[PDB]
Amino acid sequence: GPTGTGESKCPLMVKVLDAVRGSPAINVAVHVFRKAADDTWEPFASGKTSESGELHGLTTEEEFVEGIYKVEIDTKSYWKALGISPMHEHAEVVFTANDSGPRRYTIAAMLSPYSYSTMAVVTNPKE
């Protein structure tokens, strides 16, 4: 298929790949927040990617609750490694959850400052 490749432990796998290099970014500062009761975003998890571009071990299933969550990727850290023109600062995306469970999915995101952005999100059965 187009998406869904690779194993993981966390309930949500984040893959940070480069659209200009066509390879996974290393040491990609990523953060995960959750929608609070004050229409704000609280700290949920955070971590960096590896040579594989995969980032797991953020949180557990007992801590991973339902609700909306916002993810922030620091591409600048990866752009400074080679010295690429930092067209933008960081990439922030919001994901709404309706129900958790098995059959975890992985989010494939591509980094492209020059060309149009590229991101892929997968949905699970909550019916």
Curated annotation (Swiss-Prot):
CDD domains: TLP_Transthyretin. Changing Y114H: In CTS1; amyloid deposit on carpal tunnel; patients show no other abnormalities. PROSITE patterns: TRANSTHYRETIN_1, TRANSTHYRETIN_2. Changing I84S: In AMYLD1; amyloid polyneuropathy; almost no RBP binding. One of its GO terms (cellular component) is protein-containing complex. Changing Y69H: In AMYLD1; leptomeningeal amyloidosis; vitreous amyloid in some patients. The keyword Signal applies. Changing V20I: In AMYLD1; late-onset amyloid polyneuropathy with carpal tunnel syndrome. Changing T49A: In AMYLD1; amyloid polyneuropathy. It is found in: Secreted; Cytoplasm. Belongs to the transthyretin family. Homotetramer. Dimer of dimers. In the homotetramer, subunits assemble around a central channel that can accommodate two ligand molecules. Interacts with RBP4. This is Transthyretin.
